[PDB]
Symmetry: C3
Subunit: 386 residues, 3 copies
């Protein structure tokens, strides 16, 4: 659908992942924080190439396609919400219900035969952990847990975060995050010194292929992911040599982090524990279009009462956001950007030369290829045909 | 020629209009005001995708293609008019007559065999009502009146105006202007209050389909257009309801405007009377390229002597330009812009969902499809082949 | 390979030149001055569409493709030269030798099976006359002299220069430089007055076709070029007439320049003598990509000792650079730019209408078509396929 068929033949058995340049349909995706959208103040965003409107009405979130059925304009060019339950297109006043998208009135012609006989596309929206998730899919949504990493939705788990727009395809972001050897780029992070981390330069793998990862297709809520097990039979590399001469060393700190690393559909990474031995990082790479993604970062820490939550919030702001989310992950951002050119023409997928640690990524490409709930296409974006 | 043949099959009987993304050839178009081009001061513009040069020589206008026959450079990069009757290309001095475009000399080789045996394309130019019209066509031009709305060329009719470049396809501009229900966008215009207009929100049409418009193919000078007759059997809407609740009202002023509205080939709208009961608006949407048009606005008012003309000019400057041409039509401009995305891939023409007032636009699409004097193509732009 | 096959059929026997939009492979090209690259300070550039890294190591130049074999990132995003003889990719520390491009180590996995079994592309580099030349080709390079104009590599010849990036295809630059009638554009140059040059407006050619040029395929070092002989049987034009009236004259100075003019593969012009009767100009138009070239200007003057070289350098800086390289050749730059649009769609090659002086260019197109060492393609740029 999205990629030259000749390229897809050459990547037999990751073909669906390579074709998924616009992301996977029929999954939940986070797109903003609860606090960023107030009652009766609609917001625009693009998700899987589709312009959407989100509104809060009586505290509850509704999502409509931001495209009038009449002449295809964005309603958001000029929002006219003239009753709590509706939005009126600024152009000829076609009026839609937030709840089901039905065209319930037209101000310019209250006798039109279109009234009650057209419906704008809606998508389910759910808040959880102060995060807004949209189900960019058709039919009844699965439970959110299916599309979230283990422990993200535990009651005591306190989630704080940052979101921004990054100029790479979402897959470059996923692959970079789940890439065992990419740790090399983090070797000079401020967070490595100022939080005393142990961080290898890389890994000398051991064991067979299958032992490099755990493929999860047996989780009870239907989650699908891969654990990076390179450290189980593998030896960490702390001395980097060229011609046998030591030219770089890893970091010899006390704090042990990233005991478990896992990537889940539709494209969320869990690193545990990180950036501190008492915390978790969950980050999403959410497809906006083929060139762009939301880098939706969250840090989870169990909190037992309001006091622990106050405490957490204060170190999040003063330490963990500037030192980890920025000071550690900024390098991830420009690593992703550096892969764009080679993958832009879809040929990177056939001309890359992989090495042993890339077995984690291969396993993700196969898991995504097989367990995704649908390939988003340009036809989904441009609509059904009249 | 311009649009995927599969899309053209799906719009049977507006096909030629849908294909006409570069405009219609063999029509007159206004491109600037007389006063903007002085004796011996040539100007560049693009029209139907073609770069043109216009010059005033002994008070009379001449138009040449701004593209040297030799290496395809624009002569306008550096104009060398070295005799009244000629222009010399800055590059190898190939020299052309303004009057007929004939290559009459080459300064770099006065013995060249090309001399007298090559001719640059010319187009007829005519001034009328202080407006410059170019016939972007081949052969002897028709009379200007064919390509102008009724009454624009009456002797007493005093024409004043504004021109600018707008970033939409010309057809989006035409359709917006002739769109009976688009009046909704004008509901908050400064001109509606400060000139006390009656302005409905829209119309509940009545009568049959044929009664919604008058198709003119019987006018004596060969004009072809459509009158919007929605108001004849239709009821104006002044109260906009959602779920039966009044949420917006129209404007209840004294001044009656836009009794007659008509769109003519090649793409000029006449609204009478407007913006005042003693005036007319004629506005053109002139194709520059596929993404761009001149929004050539004029206001006509009968003046019987120099005194009335002085009077007119002074209210034009102080009131009608800032309050109407800008304060009313600015909303038209961004309405046109808002349609670009849906029509950019040529699919809007098949995926729009029209309603009853769009019968005016359908009638225009059929009139344009049938009575246009030619479809401009990329081959017209890039030239005949050697 | 690069141009619609239907266009190539229509230019039978310049087809290879018309297809060579990315330049000719298996030739030497100058890309920078010796002084611009210091010991251990690597530089990035693009040549024939390929991103390259150049380094100076123990005073000697090495060139590697700036593209990691692993995930296709540019090593130059963050250079890590951790031993004199190597460069380590910033991403997973794949480490390459400058000398042969062999992947000799990976810091992230010193046990990888890739080590010693992969090789990054290298290109030969040679300095001569304080100019850096790269052989953008495969196999053992020919001697540099093959790809340089006569006399450029004479021991006494002192070479000084300027380089910059110009936004046209390299062929527009070549053709402009070797274009006998383009001298018209130089008629108002500051250098024409302030250095008292004789400069015609153009030429009335005489003799037959073959006498307009000397095609050199008989030079002993394998050089291939064309001499412009228009002035041998031709008459210079000093009076430009329109309808027999003199409207422009040439320049009637004392200093005779440009007695011999020659264009050589891969695309270097020699004008002798110029810009002074005791000097030579050699300028290259080096393909960067399809839209861009290095305009690599040099002035050669025989110097017999360090004193003459000091003298030369001082007038180069104070006079010849600002007055000639800039004050004369700046017009060349915007002439080249003015041809871009007509040649952008590859149709200029069929729709141009040539005249008698263009016989020099035709002869160059045939010489290039026949004696080029290879056509650079997008496949050379994007690589061999896995
Ligand atoms: O993925 C990792 C491996 C080892 C140490 C830290 C990380 C890590 C944590 C959060 C986000 C990332 O991109 C990481 O690379
Ligand atoms: O087209 C109209 C319909 C009703 C009231 C005013 C206008 C009008 C007049 C001039 C230019 C326009 O775009 C209009 O919409
Ligand atoms: O090519 C030329 C012909 C006659 C006089 C000067 C030149 C010349 C010298 C150096 C570079 C150029 O582009 C020229 O046109
Ligand atoms: S485009 Fe929205 S009502 Fe017409
Ligand atoms: S391009 Fe105009 S004379 Fe050569
Ligand atoms: S991209 Fe260079 S080592 Fe991985
Ligand atoms: Fe990372
Ligand atoms: Fe309007
Ligand atoms: Fe020149």
């Amino acid at each position: 659908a999205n990629v030259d068929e000749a390229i897809l033949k050459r990547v037999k058995g990751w073909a669906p992942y390579v074709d998924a340049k616009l992301g996977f349909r029929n999954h939940w995706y986070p797109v903003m924080f609860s606090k960023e959208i107030n009652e009766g103040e609609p917001k625009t965003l693009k998700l899987l190439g589709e312009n959407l409107l989100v509104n809060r009405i009586d505290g509850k979130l509704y999502c409509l396609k931001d495209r009038c059925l009449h002449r295809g304009v964005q309603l958001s060019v000029k929002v006219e919400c003239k009753t709590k339950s509706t939005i009126t297109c600024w152009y000829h006043a076609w009026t839609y219900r937030w709840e089901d998208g039905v065209l319930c009135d037209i101000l310019t012609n209250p006798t039109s035969a279109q009234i009650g006989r057209q419906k704008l596309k809606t998508y389910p929206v759910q808040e959880a952990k102060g995060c807004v998730f949209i189900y960019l899919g058709d039919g009844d949504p699965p439970p959110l847990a299916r599309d979230t990493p283990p422990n993200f939705l535990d009651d005591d788990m306190e989630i704080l975060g940052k979101n921004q727009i990054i100029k790479s395809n979402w897959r470059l972001a996923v692959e970079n995050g789940f890439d065992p050897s990419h740790i090399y780029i983090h070797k000079d992070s401020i967070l490595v010194k100022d939080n005393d981390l142990a961080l290898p330069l890389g890994f000398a793998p051991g064991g067979d292929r299958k032992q490099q990862t755990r493929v999860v297709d047996d989780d009870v809520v239907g989650r699908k992911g891969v654990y990076d097990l390179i450290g189980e039979h593998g030896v960490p590399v702390f001395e980097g040599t060229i011609g046998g001469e030591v030219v770089r060393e890893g970091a010899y700190g006390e704090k042990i982090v990233a005991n478990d690393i896992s990537i889940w559909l539709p494209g969320v990474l869990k690193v545990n524990p990180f950036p501190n031995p008492d915390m978790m990082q969950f980050e999403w790479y959410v497809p906006i279009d083929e060139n762009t993604h939301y880098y939706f970062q969250t840090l989870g820490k169990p909190c037992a009462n309001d006091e622990e939550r106050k405490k957490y919030e204060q170190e999040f702001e003063s330490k963990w956001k500037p030192m980890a989310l920025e000071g550690f992950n900024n390098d991830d951002i420009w690593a992703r950007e550096a892969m764009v050119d080679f993958y832009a023409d879809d040929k990177g997928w056939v001309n890359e030369i992989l090495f042993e640690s890339d077995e984690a990524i291969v396993a993700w490409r196969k898991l995504a290829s097989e367990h995704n709930q649908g390939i988003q296409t340009q036809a989904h974006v441009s609509g059904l045909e009249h």
